[PDB]
């Protein structure tokens, strides 16, 4: 039974032998086998009592269970609670991930499962390498288990040991003559993972095993990755690999200096200048067969600089920090192209710093260029749009003007990103549908915040027309949330979430200007949700009729003038007069009620319950449907 399953789970959790023995006996065989071969749903996650016994290092109770019964370790369970909680793993997987050697050895001694394959085909060796215990890895290797198991993206245990700090695990893995040239899905052959966390010993061990250098899928060498991670030690080690040439040395120094120019943890402008001057000196070190810096066309977002082709211009900007950071951004963009994953993360950091230092217009340009690059890369830029809305609301709250073409550009980019988000949501059925829908709702909320900011900015007539065109384009795809909420519903609802940043000071929902702009852009005023509520149904449920009576009056006037039905019904057959829950909203709706004979006739038809099917025009059938 489920209660008996909980009882035996609690008995096995405390590591008590006699309590579990008294709760796993005096019964038949089928119930006992069900008890020892099922998971218990604890805290929203299903887990075997053996899992919770191995997690606490209760080796005696599970050993006596193996002695007194024939319980197997092949039970399907989760992996860990560290942001994964995916099922399919065996009990030996969590035993190896629990950092307890004795439970692993007793599970191996009775029905070893060293070659378990989950949905991600992760062996217990993966969990042992994640834990970082040498003895468990050694015993699992001695248990005749393959060490060359590659996942769907080729998650080799050597790669995940190089990513972690366990140099002992990776050195034991390479001591068995494992292949270091293991290709991954992204082309990372275990050196990009090694030289990303600044593991000098792991990188030295892999270079000792001659892991070789190959450019991955993103067009980056492992040395370029090392320079990207702001780790000088691994760069200095890789520069002595004897196969680097002149082309990949000065560019690696420039990439390291650019990474040091704009980073959160590692921000040293003097180190950046020293590395840049060293790279410039190494370029102009002989005078013959000179390796000149390639000159990209100037970019408006990065000021108006034209790189540093000379040591003189590099020297003159030693005391000017922002020009140095712009130069670092320029050389990073030149080296890494317009296709790297982390190409805009230093740009994001610099924009955040600029906003924190009240430098806004340059921050706006930098974040606009970063958004353009990320949209070129086709990634989830919901957080970038959230930052856009936050900085725009901060500028508005600080009584600072906002450039209308910038608003139009970020609105159009957000519209396109919402289009691809809708395409992804349509494509995604059940893999990450919750995350996709959360990003969908976040994109909708950010668009609403941007619209609210745009309503509070003085803009040109052409700029206003372009913004209205963008809003028209977004509405004419009809985005919807989980509970059928259109964009108009979100602009009318009082329960629309507002971000904890400066959006609270400016973007307040319900907002009359947002709804007026949406209806002037041709939003569907009669659109219903999953629950049948219209925009007029939600606006009467507003529980603050007098504090912001301006907002309520303007939005009801706009909804009625746009053509909302002041008499339609939801799925619960409730008129917004009846669903008004407020005297003021009821009175405003009654004042704005434009009565018609069709409405009264349909309401009397619905109230008296007359079968209207196949007796009315088809377009009138919908009229009976909501009236």
């Amino acid at each position: 039974m489920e209660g008996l399953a909980g009882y035996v789970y609690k008995a096995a959790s405390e590591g008590k032998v006699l309590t579990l023995a008294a709760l796993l006996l005096n019964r038949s065989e089928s119930d006992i086998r069900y008890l020892l071969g099922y998971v218990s749903q604890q805290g929203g996650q299903r887990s075997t009592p053996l899992i919770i016994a191995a997690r606490n290092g209760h080796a005696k109770v599970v050993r006596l269970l193996l002695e007194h019964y024939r319980v197997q370790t092949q039970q399907t369970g989760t992996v860990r609670f560290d942001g994964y909680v995916i099922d399919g793993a065996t009990a030996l997987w969590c035993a190896a991930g629990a950092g307890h050697f004795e439970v692993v050895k007793l599970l191996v001694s009775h029905g070893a499962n060293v070659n378990h394959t989950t949905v991600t085909n992760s062996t217990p060796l993966r969990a042992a390498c994640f834990d970082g215990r040498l003895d468990i890895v050694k015993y699992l290797v001695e248990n005749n288990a393959n060490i060359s198991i590659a996942n769907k993206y080729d998650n080799t245990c050597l790669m995940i040991a190089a990513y972690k700090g366990h140099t002992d695990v990776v050195r034991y893995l390479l001591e068995q003559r494992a292949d270091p040239n293991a290709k991954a899905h992204c082309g990372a052959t275990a050196l990009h993972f090694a030289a990303e966390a600044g593991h000098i010993d792991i990188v030295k061990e892999l270079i000792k095993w001659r892991a070789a250098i190959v450019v991955n899928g993103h067009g980056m060498t492992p040395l370029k990755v090392a320079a990207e991670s702001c780790k000088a030690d691994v760069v200095e080690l890789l520069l002595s690999h004897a196969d680097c040439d002149r082309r990949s040395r000065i560019e690696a120094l420039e990439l390291l200096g650019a990474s040091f120019a704009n980073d959160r943890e590692n921000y040293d402008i003097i180190k950046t200048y020293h590395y840049l001057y060293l790279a410039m000196l190494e370029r102009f070190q002989d005078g013959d067969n000179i390796l000149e810096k390639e000159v990209l066309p100037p970019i408006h977002a990065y000021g108006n600089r034209t790189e540093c082709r000379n040591p003189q211009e590099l020297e003159s900007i030693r005391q000017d920090r922002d020009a140095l950071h712009m130069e670092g951004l320029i050389v990073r963009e030149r080296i890494l192209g317009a296709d790297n994953i982390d190409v805009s993360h230093p740009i994001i950091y610099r924009g955040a710093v600029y906003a924190d230092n009240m430098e806004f217009e340059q921050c706006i340009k930098l974040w606009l260029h970063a958004l353009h690059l990320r949209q070129k890369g086709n990634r989830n830029t919901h957080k970038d749009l959230l930052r856009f809305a936050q900085v725009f609301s901060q500028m508005i709250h600080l009584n600072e003007t906002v450039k209308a073409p910038d608003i139009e550009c970020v609105l159009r980019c957000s519209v396109l990103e919402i289009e691809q988000s809708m395409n992804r949501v349509k494509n995604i059925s059940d893999a990450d549908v919750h995350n996709a829908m959360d990003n969908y709702e976040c994109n909708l909320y950010t668009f609403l915040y941007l619209v609210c900011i745009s309503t509070k900015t003085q803009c040109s007539e052409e700029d206003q027309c372009k913004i209205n065109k963008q809003i028209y384009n977004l509405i004419h795809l009809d985005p919807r949330t989980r509970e059928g909420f259109t964009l108009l519903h979100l602009a009318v609802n009082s329960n629309t979430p507002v971000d904890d940043f400066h959006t609270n000071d400016v973007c307040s929902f319900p907002n009359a200007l947002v709804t007026k702009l949406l209806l002037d852009c041709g939003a569907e005023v009669n659109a219903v949700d999953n629950e049948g509520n219209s925009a007029l149904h939600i606006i009467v449920q507003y529980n603050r009729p007098i504090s912001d009576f301006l907002t309520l009056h303007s939005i009801i006037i706009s909804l009625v003038e746009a053509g909302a039905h002041t008499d339609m019904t939801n799925k619960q057959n409730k008129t917004p007069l009846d669903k008004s829950t407020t005297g003021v909203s009821e009175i405003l709706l009654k004042t704005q009620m434009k009565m018609s004979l069709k409405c009264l006739a349909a309401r009397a038809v619905r109230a008296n319950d007359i079968n209207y099917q196949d007796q009315i025009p088809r377009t009138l059938e919908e009229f009976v449907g909501f009236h």
Binding site: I587, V605, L620
Partner: protein
């Protein structure tokens, strides 16, 4: 000055012009080649709906003329259950 509404049973329903101008298709029927600019009949035909729905439509016209802005407590319009689903189609056809 007065609009003569006939029905399928030949019952006349002469009401005021301003009372009958609320319904759009009534205005359309009065316009076109049917002005009759001698303010004596202004008659229109209705060869598809019975007389009781015309009675209800005329009473609704007087209702709308009387109660269009008189406070906010609009009186309850009387609709019989049997005449329902016929006044609805008539109202849709009259765009009332």
């Amino acid at each position: 000055m007065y609009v003569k509404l006939i029905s399928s049973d030949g019952h006349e329903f002469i009401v005021k012009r301003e009372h009958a101008l609320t319904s759009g298709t009534i205005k359309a029927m009065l316009s076109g080649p049917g002005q009759f600019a001698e303010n004596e009949t202004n008659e229109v035909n209705f060869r598809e709906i019975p007389s009781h729905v015309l009675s209800k439509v005329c009473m609704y016209f007087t209702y709308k003329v009387r109660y269009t802005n008189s406070s906010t407590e609009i009186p309850e319009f009387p609709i019989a259950p049997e005449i329902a689903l016929e006044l609805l189609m008539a109202a849709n056809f009259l765009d009332c």
